[PDB]
């Protein structure tokens with residue numbers, strides 16, 4: 001399955017996606033309105049639905065091909081809507097209790113990331129939460145080599161098909177990651193009153209900002 005390959009490619013998948021679901025559930029009500037930016041096949045959205053059966057999910061992505069898989073995943077779910085939109089396009093009108101994203105925002109230029117965080121806060125209710133599960137750069141080129149070693153170590157320990165890891169490395173060449181503490185400070189710059197790294201496995205981290213808390 002697609003879901004098994006993602007666990008193979010992503011170190012501490014269960015910790016990082018689990019941490020995103022847990023922090024949302026401890027920050028918003030059961031009936032929360034949640035925006036999922038770069039939802040893809042809707043993997044984080046599925047994890048949220050499992051925890052929050054009464055939550056309204058809006059799944060957003062630039063790729064109709066990716067959303068086709070999200071449509072199938074959520075075939076019979078009447079509290080899930082799907083919007084075709086770029087992160088750089090106007091966000092859907094607030095208010096949202098939570099805006100979430102997994103492995104998407106790293107594709108934007110740094111200035112576009114900072115602008116996006118500001119635009120996200122504007123569509124969040126007071127006390128609202130932004131959560132990102134993100135590929136993060138090491139703070140030095142030497143530590144980046146160690147980050148890469150640990151990613152490789154997980155992929156080989158997971159018995160990952162060679163051709164799928166090759167495709168994975170190729171996709172990462174088109175990412176523009178930065179270190180977690182830099183993008184956490186960008187949340188503070190954007191006007192989020194608290195921001196924190198909840199969980200981290202070297203190259204992959206779950207962080208959140210709160211709009212008043």
Ligand SMILES: Nc1ncnc2c1ncn2[C@@H]1O[C@H](CSCC[C@H](N)C(=O)O)[C@@H](O)[C@H]1O
Pocket residue numbers: 006037038039040041042043044060061062063066085086087088101102103104107
């Ligand atoms: N500028 C942009 N605007 C919207 N979606 C974007 C984007 N750049 C990349 N994406 C989307 O971001 C996704 C990255 S793959 C991650 C998919 C899913 N969130 C998961 O965790 O499994 C892809 O679906 C890609 O189409």
